[PDB]
A paper describes a structure:
METTL16 is the second m6A methyltransferase identified, and its known substrates include U6 snRNA and the human MAT2A mRNA that encodes for S-adenosylmethionine (SAM) synthetase (Pendleton et al., 2017). Here we describe the crystal structure of human METTL16 to reveal a methyltransferase domain furnished with an extra N-terminal module, which together form a deep-cut groove that is essential for RNA binding. Consistent with the SAM-dependent methyltransferase activity of METTL16, both structures reveal a Rossmann fold composed of a central seven-stranded β sheet (strands β3–β9) flanked by three α helices each (helices α4–α6 and α7–α9). In contrast, we show here that METTL16 is active as a monomer, and it contains a large deep-cut groove that can accommodate structured RNAs.
Numbering used by the authors: 1 to 96, 100 to 187, 222 to 291
The structure:
Amino acid sequence: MALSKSMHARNRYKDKPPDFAYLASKYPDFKQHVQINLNGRVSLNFKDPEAVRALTCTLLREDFGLSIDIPLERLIPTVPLRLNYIHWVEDLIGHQKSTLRRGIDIGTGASCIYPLLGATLNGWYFLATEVDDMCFNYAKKNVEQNNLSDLIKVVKVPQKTLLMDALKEESEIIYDFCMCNPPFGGELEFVKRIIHDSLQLKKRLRWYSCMLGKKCSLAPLKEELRIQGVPKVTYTEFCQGRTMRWALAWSFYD
């Protein structure tokens, strides 16, 4: 699969990109990090992480009613890039109408963006896992301060553990999906550990997914899934300016 403008059609920002002037009119904490470029237009220095944090936190408040607090020392998620994945997962699990859907977020991060977007947008239940202590605290706090503790269960999982170990203190039988952004041997090895877990869980999880940061990772994993004899394998490509991502999903369903 390949989408128009290499980003989801139901993405808010494909047709309506952030208007920095409008956001600086409404949000003064965002107005500081805004600068007037060599053309007279309201620009943002994307090479500065304080500016990006301001952008992410502002977008989540204006366009999603989510008030998050994130540290600069940990990965700042790009809201329109992460948003493509939510809609892609909506498509896989066949999101329409009013039947509860259960997800797993391997490495949820400081922002807990995938669960906060999912639960807000579609009312999805989430098991958000984090190995990092700081991220776990920031994520539990962000879910707590957005009254989504009923829908998102944030859990600190040990350093080595992955998907099977996350379903330890869990009693749910069928999970509609698992989404994940692996951290930066390497990436391939990580996703391969998910593949091996997916072979253990088979149909207990409807769709297993991944958001890859390196193109060189896609061809081996597609092959890895084939040699392990995985029935359904779908993969797409996303964008947000110069930053590219490769989404990869697989199912044991015929």
